[PDB]
Design a protein around this ligand. Structure first.
Ligand code: APC
Ligand code: APC
Ligand code: PH2
Ligand code: PH2
Ligand code: MG
Ligand code: MG
Ligand code: MG
Ligand code: MG
Lengths: 159, 159
């Protein structure tokens, strides 16, 4: 199977339940196996708008699902959790699942760009990733440990 | 000023309103000037979910605003139009403004990736772009004309 890293994020007032349900939903994906979970982190939301802090985590999963099938599945999870709360686009985010890495491949389609475009600049993705995959080396050759030296925690703390 | 290309999209039942309001909002952006508008196109929505067709267009503008400021402004416009409708995240999209190109620069930050990651695979971005910038050459050196040979209209027709 292919090793995949998914970023979970939620900045609802009480985001804990969203992330836990998501980790559950992910572990039960067709032809996939949950491999490891990172600690949970409280992070500062990007953008000029003032909103609730984010709850961020990263999960490692092994899968046989191709990129697009994987995306249909993660979006289905986001969609189920969002619909339940009649989620407004411009307000707190219920659950955001970003495919950070898909094996050591570079995916570029009308619906995907993997590695996630902001992985190497987002502490809320890099730090949790380093907790479960410290010796990881990105598809472009740069190692995660090197990226960490370039990206500050930026206020990131344990949830 | 820097030449920028913005993708406008909306797949509400009555999307004309949104795109027209957006074109005007863009034309009145600080230290920016509207340069040209592409024709309006009816396009097929990406993704497994079944929803209304999209209304897509491309606008060219000159600006003195740096990437981050430009983004803050386009999101402000999306937000203004979406808020009023209490827009649901998992329903039709009121207005989506994607920065397609920024001069001939490659911008990669925690909030931005330009050229837009899907530009080269999306007929709804490429065709309207070719209407107003047929001889354009992407930052990587490939011409839009050559890129067009690889991407099909995919059901794209005039609105
Ligand atoms: N690696 C990736 N993981 C998940 N979705 C991706 C992706 N690369 C591109 N996408 C696309 O991103 C689209 C919009 O997803 P959203 O979750 O609304 C963006 P976001 O995660 O809120 O912002 P961000 O990309 O700045 O983190 C999806 O419909 C999907 O097609
Ligand atoms: N070129 C670009 N233009 C606009 N937003 C961009 C961008 N590159 C990255 N983004 C980021 O994308 C984030 C989510 O924007 P959304 O509009 O919700 C994604 P979308 O446009 O719905 O899907 P898409 O990226 O697959 O087209 C923004 O908050 C912004 O920081
Ligand atoms: N701290 C923090 N900020 C964000 C995050 C996120 O996961 N964490 N996701 C975003 C868009 O998906 C925008 N901003
Ligand atoms: N036809 C069409 N499909 C889409 C579009 C779009 O503008 N047009 N935008 C998307 C996400 O921003 C997803 N899908
Ligand atoms: Mg995200
Ligand atoms: Mg996402
Ligand atoms: Mg957008
Ligand atoms: Mg878009």
């Amino acid at each position: 199977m292919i090793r995949v890293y998914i970023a979970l994020g939620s900045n609802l007032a009480m985001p804990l339940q969203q992330v836990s349900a998501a980790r559950e939903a992910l572990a039960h994906l067709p032809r996939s196996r949950l491999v490891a979970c990172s600690p949970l982190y409280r992070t500062k939301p990007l953008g000029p708008q003032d909103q609730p802090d984010f709850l961020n985590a990263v999960v490692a999963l092994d899968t046989s699902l191709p990129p697009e099938q994987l995306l249909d599945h993660t979006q289905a999870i986001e969609r189920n959790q969002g619909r339940v709360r009649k989620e407004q686009r411009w307000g707190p985010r219920t659950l955001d699942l970003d495919i950070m890495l898909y094996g050591d491949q570079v995916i570029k389609t009308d619906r995907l760009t993997i590695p996630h475009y902001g992985l190497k600049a987002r502490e809320f993705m890099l730090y949790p990733l380093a907790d479960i995959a410290p010796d990881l080396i990105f598809p472009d050759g740069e190692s995660l440990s090197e990226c960490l030296k370039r990206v500050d925690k930026n206020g990131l703390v344990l949830w």
